[PDB]
Amino acid sequence: TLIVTTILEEPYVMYRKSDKPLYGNDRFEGYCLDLLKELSNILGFLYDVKLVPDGKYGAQNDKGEWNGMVKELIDHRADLAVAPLTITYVREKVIDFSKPFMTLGISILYRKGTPIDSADDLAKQTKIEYGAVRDGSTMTFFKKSKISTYEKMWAFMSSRQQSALVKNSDEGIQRVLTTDYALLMESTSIEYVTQRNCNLTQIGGLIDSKGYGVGTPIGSPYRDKITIAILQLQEEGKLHMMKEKWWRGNGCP
Amino acid sequence: NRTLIVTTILEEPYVMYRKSDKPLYGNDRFEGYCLDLLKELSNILGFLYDVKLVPDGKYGAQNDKGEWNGMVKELIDHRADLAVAPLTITYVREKVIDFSKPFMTLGISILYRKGTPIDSADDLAKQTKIEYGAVRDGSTMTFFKKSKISTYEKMWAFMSSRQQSALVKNSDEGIQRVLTTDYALLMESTSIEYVTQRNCNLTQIGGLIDSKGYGVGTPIGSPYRDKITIAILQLQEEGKLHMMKEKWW
Numbered sequence: 001t002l003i004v005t006t007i008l009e010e011p012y013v014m015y016r017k018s019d020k021p022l023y024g025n026d027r028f029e030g031y032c033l034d035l036l037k038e039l040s041n042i043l044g045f046l047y048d049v050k051l052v053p054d055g056k057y058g059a060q061n062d063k064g065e066w067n068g069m070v071k072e073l074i075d076h077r078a079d080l081a082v083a084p085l086t087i088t089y090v091r092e093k094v095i096d097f098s099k100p101f102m103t104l105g106i107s108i109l110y111r112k113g114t115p116i117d118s119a120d121d122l123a124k125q126t127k128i129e130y131g132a133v134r135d136g137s138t139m140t141f142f143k144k145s146k147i148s149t150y151e152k153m154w155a156f157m158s159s160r161q162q163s164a165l166v167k168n169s170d171e172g173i174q175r176v177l178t179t180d181y182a183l184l185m186e187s188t189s190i191e192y193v194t195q196r197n198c199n200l201t202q203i204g205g206l207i208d209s210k211g212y213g214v215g216t217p218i219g220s221p222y223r224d225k226i227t228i229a230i231l232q233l234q235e236e237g238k239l240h241m242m243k244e245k246w247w248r249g250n251g252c253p
Numbered sequence: 254n255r256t257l258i259v260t261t262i263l264e265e266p267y268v269m270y271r272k273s274d275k276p277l278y279g280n281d282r283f284e285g286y287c288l289d290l291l292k293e294l295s296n297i298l299g300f301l302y303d304v305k306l307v308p309d310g311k312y313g314a315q316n317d318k319g320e321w322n323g324m325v326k327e328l329i330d331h332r333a334d335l336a337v338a339p340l341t342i343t344y345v346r347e348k349v350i351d352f353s354k355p356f357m358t359l360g361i362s363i364l365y366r367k368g369t370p371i372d373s374a375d376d377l378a379k380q381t382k383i384e385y386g387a388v389r390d391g392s393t394m395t396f397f398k399k400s401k402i403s404t405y406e407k408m409w410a411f412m413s414s415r416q417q418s419a420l421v422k423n424s425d426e427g428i429q430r431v432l433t434t435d436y437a438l439l440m441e442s443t444s445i446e447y448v449t450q451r452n453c454n455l456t457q458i459g460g461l462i463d464s465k466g467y468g469v470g471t472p473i474g475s476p477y478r479d480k481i482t483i484a485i486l487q488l489q490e491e492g493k494l495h496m497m498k499e500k501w502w
């Protein structure tokens with residue numbers, strides 16, 4: 001029986017809707033749960049899903065200490081992390097990621113109706129505020145970047161004691177819907193959001209290329225097996241079916 | 254430290270013979286995306302390397318008796334330390350070697366001539382006048398062979414009919430077939446991109462029908478695999494892989 005650490009994030013992992021109190025794995029549904037089910041069926045393991053106690057994904061502080069799901073793996077409090085956990089340089093040095101089960105890139109979430117069409121449109125002005133979820137991989141992309149425009153955007157994002165950043169995606173979404181604000185957001189989440197709320201749209205294409213992967217502790221004997229199962233699921237068209245299932249939403253033009 | 258043996262294969266624009274007016278020797282024989290990648294990896298990780306073309310000139314597939322060939326076999330048998338090529342990360346291969354995380358993303362798509370009303374794989378699957386195929390024994394052909402999706406099973410039935418006459422031995426052959434005859438080639442999207450920049454009568458039809466990547470191959474248990482994965486992620490986040498692709502495409 002593996003311990004799986006995860007985090008609430010639509011539509012990957014959500015509280016199931018019911019009139020009775022829920023317990024254990026039955027508390028949850030979503031893309032990641034469907035994934036975990038397929039993975040257990042292929043590999044034959046049992047699993048206990050547990051929300052990550054500090055409710056974080058995994059980032060470093062000044063002193064080099066980790067938190068979130070990444071920390072859970074490092075400390076062996078979980079065997080797998082199944083969540084939209086972005087595969088990044090800094091994380092991959094401290095955990096063993098499976099190969100990606102989903103591809104994505106950073107893009108822009110914004111309200112419909114405007115001439116804005118790219119990141120460059122934002123970086124070369126100051127009237128439109130823009131930011132990212134604080135300490136997420138998207139923020140780290142801008143902070144570590146040495147590319148001109150992205151350097152400029154980070155300067156603005158982090159200025160004024162980081163007032164342009166948000167603590168979570170929902171806050172970002174509300175901020176886009178209410179004020180003159182664009183959120184730098186992972187493309188898969190933009191796709192999800194813009195098919196439920198027809199007032200929102202993606203601006204431009206992907207500014208980078210990356211994946212979500214299943215996290216395991218360094219040296220874990222499951223990583224390679226999960227990689228192999230993921231490849232099987234992709235080649236069978238199942239990853240694609242799973243995403244169609246959970247991204248369908250309400251439908252927007 | 255021991256000079257690493259790197260198996261690879263000629264394929265534009267990943268690995269090509271360098272154009273010079275005099276004979277070439279060693280690594281100097283070669284240029285291309287994968288040579289640039291290799292050189293970036295060696296600088297980050299600090300290894301020396303000798304590039305060696307795979308003797309049988311194959312990527313790596315199994316025969317009836319389940320025996321492997323090509324670069325994959327080279328790695329399995331420890332005749333090479335690394336494989337640096339457009340070697341698709343697949344289920345069957347990952348079971349027998351270790352791949353780094355992908356340095357490039359791609360999917361199967363369609364190479365065809367411009368000006369036609371064909372718009373998707375479906376369009377091809379439901380007809381028989383337009384011939385279509387893939388490189389024999391490549392990961393693309395294997396995808397269709399193993400698919401249980403209705404459209405793709407129908408396509409596999411077509412491709413394998415008539416003793417696989419719809420298949421080609423290599424991408425160059427496929428490309429000429431598309432240019433000359435009424436033929437569509439199922440081809441990796443990255444290669445389509447390269448071809449259509451250079452052949453203005455050709456285009457991609459429809460989107461990607463799957464999603465995968467090229468990765469550096471190492472023998473199972475190699476200590477270079479994770480190191481190379483981390484180096485790849487670093488190159489990616491610094492935008493050098495993007496630069497490298499633009500350079501060669």
Ligand SMILES: O=S1(=O)NCN(CCF)c2ccc(Cl)cc21
Pocket residue numbers: 099100101102103211230231234239342343355357358359464465466467
């Ligand atoms: O073959 S993989 O390592 N795992 C399966 N997927 C499909 C889900 F993303 C992808 C996608 C993109 C790239 Cl570059 C690589 C891969």
Ligand SMILES: O=S1(=O)NCN(CCF)c2ccc(Cl)cc21
Pocket residue numbers: 087088099100102103104209210211212354355356357358485486489494
């Ligand atoms: O983090 S990775 O495994 N290796 C780095 N890259 C960049 C190579 F394109 C990508 C791209 C797409 C996906 Cl899904 C996954 C990855």
Ligand SMILES: C=C(C)[C@H]1CN[C@H](C(=O)O)[C@H]1CC(=O)O
Pocket residue numbers: 009057084085086132133135136137138139168169184185186
């Ligand atoms: C939803 C959140 C905060 C996560 C999801 N993947 C990124 C990560 O794994 O860091 C974060 C998003 C982002 O940074 O745009």
Ligand SMILES: C=C(C)[C@H]1CN[C@H](C(=O)O)[C@H]1CC(=O)O
Pocket residue numbers: 264312339340341387388390391392393394423424439440441
């Ligand atoms: C060019 C060739 C024959 C290779 C390249 N990658 C795939 C592989 O690694 O199998 C093959 C192409 C394909 O099957 O469309």
Ligand SMILES: [Cl-]
Pocket residue numbers: 097098099227352353354482
């Ligand atoms: Cl990996």
